[PDB]
Amino acid sequence: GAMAPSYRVKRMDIAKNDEECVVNAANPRGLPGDGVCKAVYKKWPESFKNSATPVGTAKTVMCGTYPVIHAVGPNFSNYTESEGDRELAAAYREVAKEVTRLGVNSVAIPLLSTGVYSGGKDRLTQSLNHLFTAMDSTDADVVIYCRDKEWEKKISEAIQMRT
Ligand SMILES: [Cl-]
Numbered sequence: 001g002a003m004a005p006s007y008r009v010k011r012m013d014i015a016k017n018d019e020e021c022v023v024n025a026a027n028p029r030g031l032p033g034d035g036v037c038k039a040v041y042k043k044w045p046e047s048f049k050n051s052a053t054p055v056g057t058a059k060t061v062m063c064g065t066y067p068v069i070h071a072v073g074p075n076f077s078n079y080t081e082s083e084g085d086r087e088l089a090a091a092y093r094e095v096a097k098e099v100t101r102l103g104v105n106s107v108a109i110p111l112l113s114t115g116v117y118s119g120g121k122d123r124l125t126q127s128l129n130h131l132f133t134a135m136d137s138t139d140a141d142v143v144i145y146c147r148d149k150e151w152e153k154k155i156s157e158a159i160q161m162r163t
């Protein structure tokens, strides 16, 4: 575990993270994809061997000894708000199980279903609150990666609010 488990946020490419493992915002088919998924494919392509997994699940594949946790959030273009919300919460609970199983002291994590799977809606708060529900009982240092300047400020504020 980390000596004083924390949450932090950085605005940069998650492929340049400084943590002991990475969560990919994966598609269900283990394809290179776009956005976070394509950056992860360029950095850790060996981790996409048999990475296909259903919506609401996470599957870990090692790149050397570096763990890539493929977490499949719902595409809100296809899911109802209700069913999508349930699957998004479930994907983060499966990330918390994998992080715990791996015995890492730190994890780099993107906000699932906030990009091309958002169905054109701002899901910062929805996705971050599901991340917190899952990860609060883990003792890993969590570092959230984003690309937008206004998102960095809002994520930082939400972390600081809980103290
Ligand atoms: Cl960068």
Ligand SMILES: [Cl-]
Pocket: 025, 112, 113, 114, 115, 116, 117, 118
């Ligand atoms: Cl997405």
Ligand SMILES: [Cl-]
Pocket: 146, 147, 148, 151
């Ligand atoms: Cl972002």
